[PDB]
Amino acid sequence: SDRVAQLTIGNSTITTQEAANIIVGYGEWPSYCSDSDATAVDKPTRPDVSVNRFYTLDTKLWEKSSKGWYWKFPDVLTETGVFGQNAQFHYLYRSGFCIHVQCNASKFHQGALLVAVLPEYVIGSVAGGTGTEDTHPPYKQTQPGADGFELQHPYVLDAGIPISQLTVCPHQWINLRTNNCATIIVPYINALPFDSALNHCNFGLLVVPISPLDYDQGATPVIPITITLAPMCSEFAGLRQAVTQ
């Protein structure tokens, strides 16, 4: 009975009492991050629990002709909030996460969603769509902002990625039999210890409806899905002034 959460900030909040349980990861111990291998030797700090709390970032709708969506991690909150300014003026970042997506369906509604968190994913961009003519994709698809971006082809994930072979990542189902909300757990993984928040892209989410949305005419056409995230025990290194360069 450890599927509880105490959350209250701003003016509203969301907590659960009899939700769809949780998913455990790696069966492991708590720890901080490696400190005695950086370029410099200065002592680290610990920002603690100053600002880490949940604000929803988008309530994505699900419709009859949903084609797929995703996000860029951690580009979602790198530009907004005191966390945004801290990430902008600070070079090194690391923290854990507890992803909680709210996904409810009514008695009338039937269907399921294909929500897959894909780490380390080199993003499959539009790249001109065809890509045979050298017209480079503009910046309006590299830094979309809080809106995310629309993925082109589901069963190849814009990169040749056949759908049935996505099973490697933590796989989740959205069904009124299964869950009133889904939980995703991911720690901090990178092939290199230290990097900037503007050059390197870690990964992003992915959502493609595994089942088409259907309902007899007379019901709600779209289904909103809410997402929020708050990193737990966040620590930032490369402490410096408010200087981008």
Binding site: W29, P30, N199
Partner: protein, 297 residues
Amino acid sequence: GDRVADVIESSIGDSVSRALTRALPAPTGQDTQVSSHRLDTGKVPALQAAEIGASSNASDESMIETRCVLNSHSTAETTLDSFFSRAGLVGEIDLPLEGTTNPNGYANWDIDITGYAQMRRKVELFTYMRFDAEFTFVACTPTGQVVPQLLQYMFVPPGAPEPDSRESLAWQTATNPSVFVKLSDPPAQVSVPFMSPASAYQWFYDGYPTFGEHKQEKDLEYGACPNNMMGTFSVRTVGTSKSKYPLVIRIYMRMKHVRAWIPRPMRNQNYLFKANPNYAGNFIKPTGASRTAITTL
């Protein structure tokens, strides 16, 4: 002194990557045997369902029974990680006496696994890797015979300037040792350790390996890093005795000291450049051929 206890909430005991969950080791384990049908409780682990592992409140097998199977197979030496190499064509190059593709008399090729995607894509199924490599250069005639000529091999370490003439300074390569080989000696066989600047080779990586603001000018460095690479190899003929026969080389590749991570699934499409996510969208075809019906062929 010791008055306030605000910070004591910490959880010292650092073991692995950041998280908050906790577990505990156990000294020994558990076992299970097999039996037949019986209505009893307490101890009944005989059968195992991978997810449920029990019987629902609606009976699954109330009508018939099951059977048993015995094992006689061994799995000790079935691992493939390093031994998965088998036969397959690899590739070749040529150094003719008179030609247009080689107006200089020497050939300098950039060393990489990006040689020929046909078989590299089999190894390219992963992203983060640590391995040993081997390069074999076998020399012969373009016709397919053997001729007693005078040849030798010079290595180009990374960071050295790329030769632009038959008499460049790159031939001295002071910090590069020398290998005593000749056409009479067995063909080239050189080991290559893991000198990646990072923990693994970067192919599926979205970033900017050059400092400064990112613009349309600085986009070609995807895959072809001018300096981050492990160098090239230059081949020519040294000495006053110039060869009177054109020559050809075949390049053989082999990998040792396997250590991999990050499983990445199979690709059913084609690229157009190195690590280019672009695909033939107008002619997408599934990974397998289907039929008008599944019942009959």
